Design a protein that fits this description.
part of a larger assembly; 7 chains; A: mainly beta; 8-stranded antiparallel β-sheet; 11% helix; globular; B: mainly alpha; 2 helices; viral protein; Semliki Forest virus viron
Chain lengths: 161, 52, 161, 161, 161, 161, 161
């Protein structure tokens, strides 16, 4: 159910980034804008995406571009609501507590930056940038959306995956 | 003759542009089943004197 | 039920436009005003309806007229309410999401412009103008209505059908 | 039930008006005022009613008068709400759609003017004046009441009764 | 079967030519050219075919035109080889012997010019022009296709249909 | 049987050609020569074929090269006989009528250029270049072999795929 | 029976006449002459009849023409005796009473001028021109035949159809 829809949405809304032939990050199609973390280096595995001109921002660690017309049908749906509870992820379930996203396991590994965090209904709420080894858990440094503005949360001890 | 001709050209241009501004302001109200907004109706006379 | 009643509305309230013996577009009777997209050129296939004088708006791509008294009763009924959901169309069902109308199939064709989108109760909400081929889907450049103002919505890359 | 109450209230609250000995109009009693259309010519078939002083108005096409004290018990009840729905009439049921009153039959005839239009509960709303040849229907040109104002609605092409 | 394909090809590739409100000829479509007899006079009953430029030849008694792009799929197919045997016709069967086309029936009547004579595979072989009644048989004055040249054969005593 | 042999020959003797990583054409091996349409641009997906010198002709709209020696066992067989009938194509069946190649489907899309048309025994007869929308059918602008000459047939109004 | 050969003779001997594309009258083939009411305007839906020159007479309100030789077998037969009784007509049965022709119902409508009146044997007796609302019935203003001269009878208050 939820897992199958998440896997299909991810296969249609994430593309790998490989440099020296090896993958290092994931660029996601959110709303109508290609979004990928700025710190990752490489190229996107697609001609249309790779040709596009990317607007940079180092303070948000983010590159964005306006998606082309022939792919807007394969783009996830977004949102700006953050109720307390549980959320989905390609590596399992994430726990939202005290305004923070937490990983129950500390299973994050380098090279998994840029992978989105999903909602109950398939909407996208955040984008993973890094992790901080917090005891038996891991605090996620992510990029969210407010009603109109992008904000960044980076707990101390975070490492750019 | 030159001055009179230029004055007539200027006055015709001004009148035509006034009527064009009227039409471009009042045309969207001919495309909805809506009212004429009597406030604007009084200032900008419309061809419908009573209907709609 | 719904399909048959919508087909009845369409037969009593849609008229073809002839140009050089080939069908070019359709004109619908809504409220009390004959409607027809401006970019479609030709003559309405009716002696009574041809003699009416049309009011232009090249910015809204729309030509309107005040309907004569003796076809006043054979016209549909209108509204202005656009909640999220699904709506009808002569070529199937249409999806309303994020202020956009989407076609499931890309079944739009040239010469299809000007056929209204119906509501669930049979009310008229919008007039289709053109389609932007959104990958597998097809966004609609459509003429929607406000409380008292006609507004035109046009996504990137639409073609006047 | 509803038909019976409608016809009884019509019977005790409608008086004929005849000229050259033939019935020409219907003068009804509402609230606390004898009211009748001004365009009809004749006299009201009651000695008591014939002697009153009738206030004129050609813009509202309405002749009004203050009723004697001993006719107060046979007075209808008035209202000003017009929600969507169905209302009564001596000749059947009348439809409300978009501020217009519509007669299904197209059987309204000259000399029918002055007949009240009843609510479901037995209150009155308006007084019929004429009809417009509405294809298969007839659109009623009727005089209604706002909160405190008389209003006259005359659809185009209407002819007086 | 041969009848049914002959009739289908006839219906897809024959257009009546009427002048002064009455039928006088037939124009057929072969390959990518429109033929018409020249001894007949009138206008082809089609908007596309009426305004096309026609090249005439009274020596060959024939007018031709180039057919439009959209209508090329509604045309017969030609063949020049004429082996001895039997051939089809809208009014029955025809025989080819000794360089002439003979009508067994004597069914020729004024206005009969302009239907093609079909091959056994439904292919167009010739277009009838006139007839000469020689006893029980009617020798056909017909225009045909050679390998590259267009030739006309006219037996003595033929009359224009 | 026939279609399986066609698919085998296609797998053995078609190399795709891409431009900025997107498939745009097909280069087929016929006899002892590699040929490719000229209006399509890119590089053949083969290191061995990347270095071979192409002789070009935009009048015939085609470029060819002598194939490497070791791949001469990997080529089809050609034929110049084109009898009237039906032939095979990668998207179904094609009709050879009147010196033209007709697509029953009208299913041709941009990027189909370079796909050969096979004989009944699997021999290569011609190479598809473009298509012309002939109503319900589609005429194929194609490159064919005479006994000694290479000639090109292009219907009016076609477009380069 | 009577109605059956009346209808057959009707199909063979009445042609409709249209102005602005809508029918307003009829023409009948009687004896050896076409005759049509003068007050009705339009054109007969037949080339041969349209090309003839019509002799006009406003006093009798009639125009006539000599029928073509090839249509001489498609004409009804006339009579001069008018026995008292009943006769057949396209909308039922008429009765001849005291030198007046009347319809039982007054169902005749404008545009029906020119519809002939047949006898018991089918012989033609008179041609309708107009109708006069005479109480519950409607008198027919028609064109009759004497032994040699046409007479027109018009009831006072009749309106031309």
């Amino acid at each position: 159910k939820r897992e199958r829809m998440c896997m299909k949405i991810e296969n249609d809304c994430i593309f790998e980034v490989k440099h020296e032939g090896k993958v290092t990050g994931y660029a996601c199609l959110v709303g109508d804008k290609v979004m990928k973390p700025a710190h990752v280096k490489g190229v996107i595995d697609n001609a249309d995406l790779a040709k596009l001109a990317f607007k940079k921002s180092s303070k948000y660690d983010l590159e964005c571009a306006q998606i082309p017309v022939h792919m807007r049908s394969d783009a996830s749906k977004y949102t700006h609501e953050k109720p307390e509870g549980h959320y989905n992820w390609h590596h399992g379930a994430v726990q939202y507590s005290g305004g923070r996203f937490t990983i129950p396991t500390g299973a994050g590994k380098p090279g998994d930056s840029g992978r989105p965090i999903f909602d109950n209904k398939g909407r996208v709420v955040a984008i993973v940038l890094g992790g901080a080894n917090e005891g038996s858990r891991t605090a996620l440094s992510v990029v969210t959306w407010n009603k109109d503005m992008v904000t960044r949360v980076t707990p101390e001890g975070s490492e750019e995956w | 003759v030159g001055m009179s001709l230029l004055a007539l050209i200027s006055i015709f241009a001004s009148c035509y542009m006034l009527v064009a501004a009227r039409s471009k302001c009042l045309t969207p109200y001919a495309l909805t089943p809506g009212a004429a907004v009597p406030w604007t109706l009084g200032i900008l006379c419309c061809a419908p004197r009573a209907h709609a």
